[PDB]
Every structure is written in structure tokens, then in C-alpha cells.
Amino acid sequence: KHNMKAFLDELKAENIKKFLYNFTQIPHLAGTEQNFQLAKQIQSQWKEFGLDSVELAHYDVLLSYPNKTHPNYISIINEDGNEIFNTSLFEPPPPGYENVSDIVPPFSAFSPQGMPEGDLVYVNYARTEDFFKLERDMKINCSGKIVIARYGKVFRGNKVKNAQLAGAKGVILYSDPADYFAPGVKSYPDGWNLPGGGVQRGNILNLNGAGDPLTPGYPANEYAYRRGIAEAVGLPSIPVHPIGYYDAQKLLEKMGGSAPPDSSWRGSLKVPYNVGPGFTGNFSTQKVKMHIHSTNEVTRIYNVIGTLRGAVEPDRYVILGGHRDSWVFGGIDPQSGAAVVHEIVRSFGTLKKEGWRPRRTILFASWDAEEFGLLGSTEWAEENSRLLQERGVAYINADSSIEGNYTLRVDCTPLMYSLVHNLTKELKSPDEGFEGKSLYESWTKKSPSPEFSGMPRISKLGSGNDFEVFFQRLGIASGRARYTKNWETNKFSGYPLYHSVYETYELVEKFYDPMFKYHLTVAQVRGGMVFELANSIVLPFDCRDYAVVLRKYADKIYSISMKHPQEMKTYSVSFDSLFSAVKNFTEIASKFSERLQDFSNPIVLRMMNDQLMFLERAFIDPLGLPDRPFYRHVIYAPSSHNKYAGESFPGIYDALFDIESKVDPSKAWGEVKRQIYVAAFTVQAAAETLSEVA
Amino acid sequence: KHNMKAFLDELKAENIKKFLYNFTQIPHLAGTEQNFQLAKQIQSQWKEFGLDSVELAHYDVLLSYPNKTHPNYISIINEDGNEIFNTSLFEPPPPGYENVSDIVPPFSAFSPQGMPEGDLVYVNYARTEDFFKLERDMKINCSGKIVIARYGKVFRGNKVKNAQLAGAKGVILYSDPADYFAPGVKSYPDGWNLPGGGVQRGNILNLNGAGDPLTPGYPANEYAYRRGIAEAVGLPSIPVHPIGYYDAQKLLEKMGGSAPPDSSWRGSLKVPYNVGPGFTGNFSTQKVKMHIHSTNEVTRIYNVIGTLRGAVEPDRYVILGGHRDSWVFGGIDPQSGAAVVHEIVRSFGTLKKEGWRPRRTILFASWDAEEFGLLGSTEWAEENSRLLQERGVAYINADSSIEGNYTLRVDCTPLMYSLVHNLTKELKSPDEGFEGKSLYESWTKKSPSPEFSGMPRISKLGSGNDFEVFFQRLGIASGRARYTKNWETNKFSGYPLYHSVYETYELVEKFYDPMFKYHLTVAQVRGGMVFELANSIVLPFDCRDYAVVLRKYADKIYSISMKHPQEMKTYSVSFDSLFSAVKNFTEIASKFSERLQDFSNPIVLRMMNDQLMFLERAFIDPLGLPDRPFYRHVIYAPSSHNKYAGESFPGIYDALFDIESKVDPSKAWGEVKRQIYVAAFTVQAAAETLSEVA
Ligand SMILES: *[C@@H]1O[C@H](CO)[C@@H](O[C@@H]2O[C@H](CO)[C@@H](O[C@@H]3O[C@H](CO)[C@@H](O)[C@H](O[C@H]4O[C@H](CO)[C@@H](O)[C@H](O)[C@@H]4O)[C@@H]3O)[C@H](O)[C@H]2NC(C)=O)[C@H](O)[C@H]1NC(C)=O
Ligand SMILES: *[C@@H]1O[C@H](CO)[C@@H](O[C@@H]2O[C@H](CO)[C@@H](O[C@@H]3O[C@H](CO)[C@@H](O)[C@H](O[C@H]4O[C@H](CO)[C@@H](O)[C@H](O)[C@@H]4O)[C@@H]3O)[C@H](O)[C@H]2NC(C)=O)[C@H](O)[C@H]1NC(C)=O
Ligand SMILES: O=C(O)CC[C@H](NC(=O)NC[C@@H](NC(=O)CCCNC(=O)c1ccc(I)cc1)C(=O)O)C(=O)O
Ligand SMILES: O=C(O)CC[C@H](NC(=O)NC[C@@H](NC(=O)CCCNC(=O)c1ccc(I)cc1)C(=O)O)C(=O)O
Ligand SMILES: *[C@@H]1O[C@H](CO)[C@@H](O[C@@H]2O[C@H](CO)[C@@H](O)[C@H](O)[C@H]2NC(C)=O)[C@H](O)[C@H]1NC(C)=O
Ligand SMILES: *[C@@H]1O[C@H](CO)[C@@H](O[C@@H]2O[C@H](CO)[C@@H](O)[C@H](O)[C@H]2NC(C)=O)[C@H](O)[C@H]1NC(C)=O
Ligand SMILES: *[C@@H]1O[C@H](CO)[C@@H](O[C@@H]2O[C@H](CO)[C@@H](O)[C@H](O)[C@H]2NC(C)=O)[C@H](O)[C@H]1NC(C)=O
Ligand SMILES: *[C@@H]1O[C@H](CO)[C@@H](O[C@@H]2O[C@H](CO)[C@@H](O)[C@H](O)[C@H]2NC(C)=O)[C@H](O)[C@H]1NC(C)=O
Ligand SMILES: *[C@@H]1O[C@H](CO)[C@@H](O)[C@H](O)[C@H]1NC(C)=O
Ligand SMILES: *[C@@H]1O[C@H](CO)[C@@H](O)[C@H](O)[C@H]1NC(C)=O
Ligand SMILES: *[C@@H]1O[C@H](CO)[C@@H](O)[C@H](O)[C@H]1NC(C)=O
Ligand SMILES: *[C@@H]1O[C@H](CO)[C@@H](O)[C@H](O)[C@H]1NC(C)=O
Ligand SMILES: *[C@@H]1O[C@H](CO)[C@@H](O)[C@H](O)[C@H]1NC(C)=O
Ligand SMILES: *[C@@H]1O[C@H](CO)[C@@H](O)[C@H](O)[C@H]1NC(C)=O
Ligand SMILES: *[C@@H]1O[C@H](CO)[C@@H](O)[C@H](O)[C@H]1NC(C)=O
Ligand SMILES: *[C@@H]1O[C@H](CO)[C@@H](O)[C@H](O)[C@H]1NC(C)=O
Ligand SMILES: [Ca+2]
Ligand SMILES: [Ca+2]
Ligand SMILES: [Cl-]
Ligand SMILES: [Cl-]
Ligand SMILES: [Zn+2]
Ligand SMILES: [Zn+2]
Ligand SMILES: [Zn+2]
Ligand SMILES: [Zn+2]
């Protein structure tokens, strides 16, 4: 039989291992020839594997690279302007790769050029709350200072935006061992920890969903009109550069001024973590100087797009997409994920060769330039937005399959909760101690839902990956799943060797997943989800799961507001309309579900599959959220303080945030009320898409 | 048989006459009790007629009314400030209605209050070109002047916007006999001409598609957050009032300053048509004073929404909509149209009672507050936007069935051209001299296409009626048809008694359509279109007709640009991408049409009906046109100089308009190129929705 079990059984751990090895021998930086070569290789193999068509879709987008003949570095400069200390020009290459060419040195992509010199202020993680503490409580002024921040907690672009708005003239990012060195494990190559010479690459844009900075709204095709650099979206205005903890220790050890305000500001290095500004008495005349010479350059990128045409509903698309570009070798990020997609295609192709086709069309994507701001996926979605919004059933992302070896991590629309629970109950746990048990059982045990006994935790979708355009811009139901660590406090920080030259095939094979069983389990989860979404006669979405979370989010936003009872009285701020809409959504969703259970009529079925498919779409507001036009979903947006995290009722949340500091409370509470009305209306409108149609 | 002929034969001239009489005995001004009563009557009768459900949908929107105890009027005021001449407080009521209560006096809806006093400047029709001529050629400065403009040529809101931007401190609108009195016909009640005491009411907003000025984007429901008046959309900033030609003659007769620049500035009254400013020597110290006391007030309005559920595709909606509110008795505008809708419902209901249902759902709408800015239709569409955009097949408007008795007038999407030609070939001409001939034959003869021998003229959709939200905001294929006059130069001016108390049942019965045969022919056209759209197995749209017009519009915009060859060289302005996209659209549309002809498979059919339905939708850009976010269609928008007229490739058109006057040509031509790229991309994207889906 050609059924999900046939699909799942064809997947092999050994194939995923071979593909990962194949994809990680040389760097595949976006815009480079080696990444174009790998695109062509994947295109060829997907054809060989049996897909109906496999094309490259190319765009010319703004990328950023260091100047090969004029290296980026930071100095401590004395009174005379002698540079007495210089940060490294490169990470020490790992064993056996000390000769591999074209390893991009650590840099912050899209930094402007400059050579600012000044006094350091240490700003902890450079979060909103850290800047509040400095400016409001400690009365330290970052204006004209170079700020030094530890990586972790939040997306680095938010750190840079926050430092910019505090008036910094430059930013130094570093990896603290507190955040990137797990106690009791060895540094690479002897373990999975970050060495003191290791450095995390990464872009520092604030795109808010725009895609290529030069062509917001429209694909960066051959005839595209581009903005000038001065009008580009999301570029930082101050130089930024990342360093490792050996170099950071040299910059931090001499810091003076104020003590750290408390222990949450102290990392693990042997330094006081003084906030500054400047150095202690003896060194008070020394300064820090950055030298940044990177250039932004419009560069061609290539997505690979594979199609497996549906037998019955070829005009309904289920999309499995993940990126191919890497900072260096991409051992975890993204080739762990791409090897799994490759094996999924291979398995589907095997069934296809035996005469099977999925009911709906499956699209497979190898995205380019994800590392430079989700550019490949977003440009292709801009090009194809009309097809995706009227035909897009679901999007499953497929970046790194693993970031740990403890248990499963799933973020998805509530519409897929039931699908995920049911599938995981049917898969074998790969975990030690759970042999013979389901993945559901091991996952539920290791990661319990905070809300419900006997269920696992599933999180809201945030951002920082290629599902952003499909979910928050276009409103297509989206999901993602990977194996993760047990390190609750490091949730948004990344695994130690994130975006470092040390992220290699050997890292994975030796220390993460020697038997490739966690990769195989993730291939079963991602592939199984795609199989059910593409083959189930009724789409496997349960609208009642949305009703449950809408009530939780309404309770949560109401609680936030109720910290300000006097203002809610003065300004007549009521959540009644939002609770009413949620109540209605609950009631209508319950009725729709009964009808879905209670209908040989393919029109009624497709009418009802259309209602299911367009239900995520109904949460889109075509006017977007305030000052963020490409975040259109009214229930979920990436947090304005941390792009990785999702926020619920983001429009109301942002209207309430720090409201006690607004100078015009009447205006500020008016805007709260406006956002309550938008959210209540959108909930009611989405509910009504599930009413009888006539 | 239950077929289109059964539908059409059930329609009766005599019924339309009875309904028109019934709808025109008392005023039905939006927001008034009598218009709520008529809403309830229509609701009851539509239920009686057999529709499955008939509801009222109410909203609370900004309307505008004169102050009953403080009348609006204009004076000539002498040196001392004695008012030596005052305009009328009301139009002389017509015979037999001199006792009818609650006739709203002439006023300009949404005028602010004020009592400005100053010197007159006469600005012809107050068009863009008229202001250019005054300021640029004649060097007359309107700043701080009261401008007096004749009605005609363009929407009155554009006149007021233009006078405002010229710095006028007030506007007087009047009906010139040149434009509102046809030679050789008698004034009402002895003929269809405007008497010198007659005055045209009408709103002077510039909403650009927004709907209720206080709630752009969102329905004006019970919990809606409203903007403050200062932030409302589209309100004029200077007082405005309309008068008749007896009063205008008194204001114009004393004008001095410059002669009219040419004969196109002279109307038919016995006055010089001096542009001013001010009065000739003897009267140079007299001034004009307006007194406006109207108030804007949030007021409840009621749409009636009738549903006839589809037998096969109940989730596909074909909408017949027209308004019910009138300025006074609404003899032509809108009850001529509403009586026809009423008879169409009655006929469909007759078939329904015999067991028939249409294949798709038909929605019938009686809109409120159209006269105050398309408020009823636009609020309901805002409420229901998700349903309409995923299920809306087509919208047929149904305002006035007649504005003349000469021949048919049709504006529609190119997707309905073939449908209109085919239907009119099947209907009887009602015209004298064409007995036994088709409507197609008489219409083609009296109104030949400028492009093609043997075809009739069909125009682009403009605006100024309730299709605006459905076509230019939401991208639903739209059409409209009425009987019209032979008066080419009066195309956008209106029939003489437009929006006057003299627009009565008697006007129509005596002078327009005594046998109600033109009404019946229009009921057959509108009803026939709805029947085919709702019942045809394959949607009756021909995508190739769009390809033909896209090429015409591309040629036209290219020609406009080519008036500036040096700039196109300097700035590298190329239309190549737009012509390429049009060529592609032509080729793909040709292939789609062959597939549509060449397929028992209901999925392929519905897939292909979805492609047809979503093809108009593909021309929508979710970012809207510059500074006009609710005009989203890239091929058609209402002209920025005249809301009644449609403009093609409006984004490029507006970028090219008056470009030789821009101070920064590089920036201005950059914006031309940007609009060419948006249009080329949108055309290509729409084409690709017609490609094979996988
Ligand atoms: C959740 O679903 C329910 C439907 O089950 C829906 O109920 C609707 O609520 C509105 C209130 O927001 C009702 O609106 C009323 O309609 C009547 C006419 O039917 C009007 O007369 C009412 O207006 C008067 O009273 C108001 C309040 O005191 C005054 O402000 C106003 O000036 C008038 O005096 C009012 O407009 C509507 O009838 C029901 N519909 C039903 C029960 O079918 C509810 O709105 C949904 N929630 C959301 C958030 O959409
Ligand atoms: C109308 O439909 C046709 C398809 O029948 C479609 O043709 C496409 O046109 C683009 C040009 O805009 C082609 O893009 C080229 O793609 C190749 C790879 O296939 C690239 O190497 C080319 O880039 C080089 O050359 C450029 C021009 O000299 C340089 O600017 C660039 O730096 C590179 O050197 C170029 O990107 C594309 O291949 C075809 N696709 C086909 C034929 O299938 C056309 O675009 C459609 N019209 C619109 C408006 O969409
Ligand atoms: O430009 C952009 O918007 C992002 C570009 C780029 N993307 C990535 O590197 N994403 C990979 C991964 N990120 C990390 O592992 C860093 C920690 C944050 N991630 C999660 O917490 C996390 C991880 C998995 C899951 I399931 C949930 C949260 C990730 O977030 O996927 C970058 O961040 O530099
Ligand atoms: O606020 C708004 O946007 C409009 C509100 C209001 N609407 C109307 O009165 N519309 C009725 C009718 N208008 C007229 O007859 C005036 C002349 C312009 N119409 C057409 O040229 C015309 C007529 C029929 C056809 I077919 C094509 C063009 C009309 O345009 O339908 C108004 O104009 O004051
Ligand atoms: C990764 O695997 C691919 C596919 O097996 C290898 O590319 C093939 O290499 C052989 C020998 O050079 C060629 O004859 C084929 O034409 C290639 N197939 C393609 C590109 O589809 C590639 O060499 C492997 N890379 C590494 C680093 O092992
Ligand atoms: C997940 O599995 C549950 C349990 O099988 C499914 O719920 C059942 O669905 C069937 C088929 O429609 C109903 O007859 C049962 O009453 C349901 N059992 C329940 C709710 O306890 C559920 O539909 C599955 N979720 C999917 C497919 O998304
Ligand atoms: C317009 O027609 C309607 C419907 O025939 C008339 O309203 C009816 O009037 C009779 C007598 O007053 C009532 O018994 C019915 O209840 C009404 N039917 C409704 C409202 O559905 C109305 O009188 C007519 N108006 C004019 C001006 O002739
Ligand atoms: C309008 O009528 C024409 C002539 O009947 C229709 O075109 C024909 O459609 C049939 C049925 O698909 C084809 O087999 C013929 O070849 C067509 N004749 C032509 C193009 O000359 C046309 O489809 C009708 N338009 C509609 C229904 O929108
Ligand atoms: C890189 O730096 C060198 C000098 O070290 C300079 O000549 C060259 O222009 C730079 N390349 C760029 C800006 O791409
Ligand atoms: C740091 O680099 C600069 C530039 O090459 C050089 O002048 C200086 O000697 C270096 N300082 C140290 C301590 O190596
Ligand atoms: C921070 O410093 C700069 C002056 O160097 C000043 O413009 C700004 O107002 C200061 N902010 C404070 C003290 O709050
Ligand atoms: C793999 O699992 C073991 C067992 O808990 C753990 O100690 C080890 O650190 C894990 N590897 C990684 C990279 O987490
Ligand atoms: C109308 O005018 C009268 C005085 O003539 C005034 O008292 C009343 O307030 C006005 N009504 C309004 C502004 O609605
Ligand atoms: C015009 O009306 C005003 C206000 O009622 C009045 O004072 C004046 O006498 C009137 N003038 C004429 C000529 O009727
Ligand atoms: C028109 O008149 C006003 C002064 O009353 C002035 O501000 C404006 O510049 C003038 N425009 C001209 C003369 O172009
Ligand atoms: C009705 O038709 C006749 C015949 O051409 C024409 O003379 C008359 O003016 C028409 N009525 C109207 C209102 O146009
Ligand atoms: Ca873009
Ligand atoms: Ca509104
Ligand atoms: Cl992922
Ligand atoms: Cl109309
Ligand atoms: Zn990644
Ligand atoms: Zn990454
Ligand atoms: Zn009208
Ligand atoms: Zn009107």
C-alpha cells in the first residue's frame, strides 16, 4: 500500500548522514559560487529523485561581505593612538580544515563602515529592559559611547536597534561563556562548547518582514526598481562587530565607572562586569576603536523549487521549505535540516515512481540567503503572493533538524496542534529509556504543557526563519519541529557553536547524533506532517484549537491592561468586545466542527476544506500592524523586542507596552482602544468565515 | 423549463412602474426615519418574494445635514455690511408636493461651518486645467478669494479639493444652463430641463475609497473606535454651497477684473463671465458672504441584504447591489434603479417558489448612505471583506436604470465584455426604428466602439457609485448598465434635474419612459448578467478580453511618456518590461482559454472557475496606490482629477502627470520607473494565475 507508513518507512538515517556529509565539506555562503553549485546539485538530484519539475528561481538582493583586503577588527588605543590590543582577524580553523578556502571571517552582516573611537559602556544583553535599567535607574548615558553587549536572550538585530536608539556610536557583540559554554563539557573539537576564539556570525537588520532591503513589496527580479541605500529597509546606522570571549575579556577587564546593578548582569568571565563608561583610573585615557570596512552589494541568489503535482487538487499547495545558504560549513545550521528535506524528497519520489501521487500538490524549497534576512523565501513569496494566498494550504519549515538531543520542540499555528499530537503518538521515541514508547509519550514527559496535564508544550511561532513571510505576511498555516536541548534559560540564545566555523559535520556526527536517529525522528515528524496535509481528504486542522488559545491570549492581554485600573476607568477601556468575539469564535467553531464530522459530496468537502484553509488567512489585516506593514497577522507577530519570540495580540501588546511612560496618556489609551477594536473585529470576521456560507 | 428565458419573461414593465411610484412619494434621505421605514418595507417584500434570508446590516457613520433653524445662504454685502441680495433658502417645490414635509434644502454635504466674506473669482469648472490656466497663464491668485465654479465635467469633490489647494476660502457651486438646460426643451414641470430655481445637492468629500470618514479600514459597528473629526478622511476645509442659475446670475453679473480667457469659459447666462477677482468699478466695494451652519453627525444607516442560496456552489457569491437613499424623492436617482432590483428579486423568487435555485448564491443589496460617500456599501464590504475576497464572483451595480432614452451605456471589467455582447444579442431592442432587432444592433448602431467596427462602446469603470469598494478595493469583477442620453459633452455632468427636488416619479413617467420599456430593457440586461454569472457552469468571463485592453492601455501610457523623449533618454525610462508582461499575459490567456474549452471533471472545472474568479483579484496590490491605500487595483483607479472617470495604469499616469513642472526631475522620473515596474510585475503575476497550477 502507498500510505503514510510506506512513506515513513522509506526514510533512512544512513541517507540523512550521507547527505549531511555531502552538504558540509565546503562553505556555502549566500551569493557565492559554491552555493550556486550546490543549488544546481540539489536541482539535479530532486529531478533524479522523481519530482515533476525542479527550477531555480533567482533574485538580485542586497547582501553584505567583509573586505578581503581590509579586515574588520577592534582595538584598545592608547593616549598616543597606538593600538595596544587587537581582536582576532579570524577564528582558528578546526582540525583538518586549516586549509579550506573561503571561510568568511566573523562579521556582522549589513554593518555600515566606520572607525568610531570612544569609551565603552557594558549593556548586558542590550534588551529593552537593560536599556531601561541603564538610563532610568542608573542614569548612565550611552550617547556617543561604544556599547558592548553579550549575545543571548534576544535577536541581535533588536540589540543593535536598541543601542542605536540609546545614541550609541558603535556596538560590540560577544559570546559570554555563561550563555555559550555549558558546565562540564569540552570546547570544540573535544566537545560541543564554544572555544574562546569562537565567534557567532549573523545579520543585524531590522527588516520587520520586508525581505530584500531595496525592493519591499515586490520581487527583486531583473527589471525591479530599487530604493537607494539611504531609503533601504532595516539597515543599522552604527558599526557593529562580533568577537569571542578571549577578546571580550581583554575589552571588559579594564572597565570602570558603576558596578553591575545586580548578578543578572554578570557573566562567567573573571571580570567585574562594570557598566562603565570607560576604563578604571590607570587606563582612563585609553579608548576603544572599531575598524569596519564591510560593503553592501547587490548579489544574485538562487532558490530551488521542486513540484510534486497533486492527483486530485493540484491547485492546493503544501510547502516544505528550508534554506541552503550557511555562514561557514553549516553543520547544524542549515544542513542538518536540508539533509532531512533531501531524504523526504527522495522518499516521496520513491512512492511517485511506483505510481503514487499525493492528493494535493507538494512544493519543496531550498531557500537562499536566509542568513541575510530571510531574503530568498521572502522574494519568492512576493513574486508568487497571489498563488500562495489563494492556493496555500500550509507551510512546514525545515531549518536545522537538531539543536540538541533531549526532546522535540514544536512551534506551529493552533490549527496544527491536533495533527502534531496525533502524528507523534504514531511515531517511535528515539530517546534512551523510552524504547517501545511513542514520541508523544517521551516528548510529553520531558516537555509538559504548562497548561494541561498529559499534553506536551507547543509554542507560538516567532520569527528568525523562512516561515515568516508565509505565516505573518500571507496568513498560511505554518509549523516547524526540531530536536532540542534541556536548557530553559538558553531558549532563544542558540547552541554554543551557533554560526561559528566550528559548526561542522564532525560536530553533529561525534557529539549530537552519532546514529542519526534524532534526524530520522525529525524527518518522520516533518515528512509525516507534509504527508497528512497533502493527502488527508479533510484538511487536518482543528479550528476549535484556535478558539482555546484565543481565550488564553485575551485573558493574558486583559491582565496586562488591568495593571492600570485607574486609566481603564478614566478612558473607558473595555475588553468586552474582544471577549465577545472570542466567545462567538468558540461557538461558531464548535458548530463548524459538527458539520465537518456530519457530511459523498466533493463540493461540500472542498467548500469545507476552503473554510479550513482560509481560516488562518482570515487573521490577516491588509493594513498591517502599526509601522510594520509586512506583519499583517492580528493574532501573532514577532515581538518588537525580540524577533525570535512570538507575541500574541501584538497590536494591543505594543500599545500597552511601557504605557505609564507616555507623555499623553489620553492619546496612548485611545490607541489601546483602537487596537482592541481591530482585534475584536478580526476575531469576529475570522469566526464568520466558518459560519454556513449562505 | 427554468432557464434564463423563464427569468427574463417574468420581468414586467408594469411592476417596475408600480415600484417606482411606491418608492418616490416621500423623501428617503440617509439617516432619516422614512428611509429606515423603506428599508423595513423592502426587507419584508424580499422575504415575501421568496429569498432564503433577508437581514438589515446597520452601521453608525458620519453624515451631514443643514441646521433646520439656521439656514445656509449666500449674500452680496455692501460697504456697510447690509445684505443687499440673498440666495434662495429652498427650491420652489413641484406641483402637488408644495406641502410634502422634510425636503432637505440644497446644501453641500460635509461642508464645514463658516461665514467667509470676500471677493469672487470665477474658475470655470474648477478642473485641474482650469486652475492651471488661472494661476500659470493668467496669473490670477485665488488665495483668500471665494471661488465660484459651474457644476459639470468632473465630480464636485475634485472641484472643492482643487479650490482648496489654490487657497480659496470658500466655494460656490452653480448649475449653468449651458450644462443643465438642453436647447428647445421646457423646464420642469413642462419638460425635463432645470428651472432657474433648481439646485443640485451632493457631497463634496475626497474619500478615495475610505468609506465612513471616521473608521477607514474597519466597519462602523457598535464598538468601533472612531477617529476624531480633525483626523477624519476626506472632509473639506472651506465652506461650500450650491445655487441655481437665477441666483448665479446675480452673483456673476457684476464681476470685473480679467475677461474669460476664451469661449470654453463662457456659459449660457447673459453675463460676461469675467474671471475677477471682485466686481466692476461701481460695485468694487461690495463683497460676497457665505453663511454655512450644517453639522456633521454620526447617524445610523441600514443596508438590506437578501440571500438566494446556490444549489451547487453556495460558497460563490454573485451580488446585485444598488442604493435606496435619495437626496429628495429620488425619481431617477436611485429609485429608477431600486425598482428594477425589486422586480429582479421578484422574478428570481418566482422561479425559486417553483423549485429552482441558481447554481451559485445570489446576494441582493439595498445600500444606504450612497449619497454621502458610498458609505453603506463600503462599510458592509469592510465587515465582510474576507468572505468577499475568497468567494466573490462578481458585482453588478443597480443605481438609476435610465438617465436618458437614447441607447444603452455599459461600464465593466473586460472580463464581462463577451457576456455583455452575447446577452444583448439575445434581447429585444426597445428603440423606435429597431423593432424586431436586437439591443446589440441598436446599441452598436447608436454607440459604436471607437476601436472596432460592428461592436458597441463599453467604458472603463470609474467611481461615484457603490461598485467602488468591490472593484477597486477588493478586486471583484464588476459591471453596470443603464439607458442614457445622446449628449457626448455632458458625459460626466448628469441629466438636468440631477439631485434636484424636481427628480420625481412624474419626471420619469411623463418625460423619460412612459411605457417603462427602457426600465424593462435595463432589468433584462442587469438581471440577465446576474443570471448567467450565477448559473453558467463555466464562469462567463473571457480572460483574452483583458489581454486586448492591457495592450491598448500600455500603448496609451507609453505615448504619454514619449512626449518627454529627452528625459526618457537621460533617466533610462523603458516600458519594455510592461510590454513584455502584456505579451506574456496574451500568450498565457490564449493557452488557458484552449484548456477551458478542452476539459466531466468538477475539480478541474472548479479549479478553472477559481482561476477565472481570482483573475480580477490578481490585479490588486495590497500596498495600494500612492497616498490612496483603498485604491488597490493596478489597472484601474478613479481619476485623481475626476472621481467619476476611470484611469488606466493610474500609478504610472499620476507619476507622469504634469511631470514637466516637477522641481526634481530625477526623483519624478525615478517614480515613473517605479510605477512601470509595479505595473509590469502585477500584469505578469496576474498572467501567471492562469498558468497550469502545478
Ligand atoms: C457576537 O455574536 C453576537 C450574535 O449572536 C453579536 O450580537 C450582536 O451584538 C450587537 C451589539 O454589539 C447587537 O447590536 C444591536 O442591534 C440592535 C438591532 O438588532 C440595535 O438596536 C442596538 O443598538 C441600540 O443599543 C445600543 C447599545 O445600548 C446603542 O448604542 C444604540 O444607540 C441603540 O440604541 C445594537 O446595535 C446585535 O443586534 C447583535 N446581533 C444579534 C444578537 O444577532 C455580537 O456583536 C458578536 N460580537 C462581536 C464582537 O461581533
Ligand atoms: C515574459 O515571459 C518570459 C518567459 O517566456 C520571461 O522571460 C524571462 O526573462 C528574464 C529576463 O527578465 C530571464 O532572466 C534571465 O535569466 C537567466 C537565467 O535563466 C540569467 O542568466 C539572465 O541574467 C543575465 O543577463 C542579464 C541581462 O543581460 C543581466 O542583467 C544579468 O546580470 C545576467 O548576466 C536573466 O536573469 C529569464 O531567463 C526568462 N525566463 C525564461 C525565458 O524562461 C519574461 O521575464 C516575462 N516578462 C516579465 C515582465 O515577467
Ligand atoms: O534575519 C532573520 O530574521 C534571521 C536570520 C538568522 N536565522 C537563524 O540563524 N535561525 C536559526 C535559529 N536561530 C537560533 O538557533 C538562535 C536562537 C534563536 N532561535 C530559537 O530560539 C528557536 C529555534 C528553534 C525553534 I522550533 C524555536 C526557536 C532559528 O531561530 O531557527 C539569524 O537568526 O541570524
Ligand atoms: O460619493 C461618491 O463617490 C458619489 C456620490 C454620488 N453618486 C451619484 O450621484 N451617482 C449617480 C451618477 N452620477 C451622475 O449621474 C452625475 C454624473 C456622473 N456620472 C456619470 O458620468 C456616469 C453615470 C452612469 C454611468 I453607466 C457612467 C458614468 C453616477 O455616476 O452613477 C454623487 O456623485 O454625488
Ligand atoms: C555530493 O554529492 C554529489 C552527487 O552525488 C556529488 O556530485 C557528483 O560528483 C560526481 C563526481 O564528481 C559527478 O560525476 C556527478 O556529476 C556529480 N553529480 C551532481 C552534481 O549531481 C558531489 O561530488 C558530492 N560532494 C562531495 C563534497 O562529496
Ligand atoms: C486526531 O485523532 C482524533 C482521535 O482519532 C481525531 O478525532 C476523531 O475523529 C473522528 C473522525 O472524524 C471522529 O469520529 C471522532 O469522534 C474523533 N475523536 C475525538 C475528537 O476524540 C481527530 O480528528 C484527529 N485530528 C486530526 C485528524 O487533525
Ligand atoms: C408601498 O408599498 C407597500 C407594500 O405594498 C405599502 O406598505 C403596506 O401598506 C399597507 C397599508 O398601509 C399595510 O397594511 C402593509 O403592512 C404595508 N406593507 C409593508 C410595509 O410591507 C406602502 O403603503 C406603499 N407606499 C406608498 C407610498 O404607496
Ligand atoms: C459568447 O458567445 C460565443 C459564440 O457562441 C461563445 O464562443 C463560443 O463558445 C463555444 C462553447 O465553448 C465554443 O465551442 C466556440 O468555438 C466559441 N465561438 C467563438 C469564440 O466564436 C463565447 O464563449 C460566449 N461568451 C461567454 C459565454 O462569455
Ligand atoms: C577593499 O579595501 C581596499 C583597500 O584595503 C580598497 O582598495 C577596495 O576598494 C575595497 N573594496 C571594496 C570597497 O569593495
Ligand atoms: C594592531 O593592528 C594595527 C594595524 O595593523 C597595528 O598598527 C598594531 O601594531 C597592532 N597592535 C598589536 C598589539 O598587535
Ligand atoms: C546624553 O548625552 C548627550 C550629550 O553628550 C545629550 O545630548 C543628551 O541629552 C544626554 N541625555 C541625558 C543626560 O539624558
Ligand atoms: C547527547 O545526549 C547526552 C545524554 O543526556 C548528553 O549528556 C550530551 O551532552 C548530548 N549531546 C548534546 C550535544 O547535547
Ligand atoms: C442650529 O442653530 C441654532 C440657532 O439658530 C442653534 O441654537 C443650534 O445649536 C443649532 N443646531 C445644531 C448646531 O445642531
Ligand atoms: C438677507 O437676509 C438677511 C438675514 O435675514 C437680512 O438681514 C437681509 O435683509 C436680507 N436681504 C434681502 C435683500 O432680502
Ligand atoms: C497669493 O496671495 C498670497 C498673499 O495674499 C500669497 O501668500 C501667495 O504667495 C500668493 N501667490 C502668488 C502671488 O503666486
Ligand atoms: C425621449 O425620446 C425622444 C425621442 O428622441 C426625445 O426627443 C426626448 O427628449 C427623450 N426624453 C428624454 C428625457 O431624453
Ligand atoms: Ca522584495
Ligand atoms: Ca469604515
Ligand atoms: Cl525550522
Ligand atoms: Cl449603476
Ligand atoms: Zn538557518
Ligand atoms: Zn542561521
Ligand atoms: Zn445614486
Ligand atoms: Zn446620487
Can you describe what's shown?
The structure is a homodimer of 694-residue chains. Chain A has 694 residues and is of the alpha/beta class. Chain A is built from 21 helices and 19 strands. Chain A folds into 3 domains: 1-66 and 293-540, 3-Layer(aba) Sandwich (Aminopeptidase), CATH 3.40.630.10; 67-292, 3-Layer(bba) Sandwich (Glucose Oxidase, domain 1), CATH 3.50.30; 541-694, Transferrin receptor-like, dimerisation domain (Transcription Elongation Factor S-II, Chain A), CATH 1.20.930. Helix content of chain A is 36%, strand content 16%. In chain A, the strands form 5 sheets. The first copy, chain A, has a 7-stranded mixed β-sheet, with helices on both faces. In chain A, strands 3-2-11-5 form a 4-stranded antiparallel β-sheet, with helices on one face. Chain A has a 4-stranded parallel β-sheet with strand order 6-7-8-10. In chain A, a hairpin with a 2-residue loop joins β18 and β19. In chain A, α8 (335-353) packs across α15 (517-535) and α16 packs antiparallel against α18. The radius of gyration of chain A is 25 Å and the shape is globular. The structure holds a molecule of 4 linked components (NAG-NAG-BMA-MAN) (2 copies), the ligand O=C(O)CC[C@H](NC(=O)NC[C@@H](NC(=O)CCCNC(=O)c1ccc(I)cc1)C(=O)O)C(=O)O (2 copies), a molecule of 2 linked components (NAG-NAG) (4 copies), 2-acetamido-2-deoxy-beta-D-glucopyranose (NAG) (8 copies), calcium ion (CA) (2 copies), chloride ion (2 copies) and 1 more. It is classed as hydrolase.
